[PDB]
């Protein structure tokens, strides 16, 4: 048995949807990310209120790819005044640190049965960028990602 993810009552988990394979590569290389203005605010608020008592996990997926491409932990608050033009969208304003945990493709078929009660019971695979995942469903997603081969 694998009971690791069942025993943890803190932590928050968000879906990250990227249009750009380049941005994913840059994020893995440099352990940084940036979302939209409203996405950055949502993640910043979550990281800050955690105050280090548990992780903020990011579940990454490229729009249209049909799979998740990995998992990272948020590792800093959002710095909103950084060098412009480092990403796909040249307007994107800001940067936060991440630490990539798992880099592997996980097909949407492995995950489409998990549904989000905070997003109209839609499959977790049909989420938009910075959709939060309820912790009890996030445990199920993380276990599937960690045991897929």
Numbering used by the authors: 400 to 548
Would you copy out the relevant sentences from the publication that reported this structure?
The X-ray crystal structure was solved for compounds 3–6 at high resolution. In our first screening campaign, we described a series of uracil analogues; compound 4 is a new member of this series with a modest IC50 value of 250 μM. The six binders 1–6 belong to four distinct chemotypes: thiobarbiturates (1–3), uracil, nicotinamide, and pyrazolopyrimidine. Despite their chemical diversity, these chemotypes feature an NH group that is involved as a hydrogen-bond donor with the backbone carbonyl of C433. Furthermore, they act as hydrogen-bond acceptor of the conserved water that forms hydrogen bonds with the side chains of W432 and D528. Notably, compounds 1–3 occupy the bottom of the aromatic cage with their sulfur atom, while compounds 4–6 have a methyl group as in the natural ligand. Compounds 1–4 and 6 act as hydrogen-bond acceptors for the backbone NH of Y418, and they also form a hydrogen bond with the side chain of D422. This interaction may offer selectivity against the nuclear reader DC1, which features the N367 hydrogen-bond donor NH2 in this position.
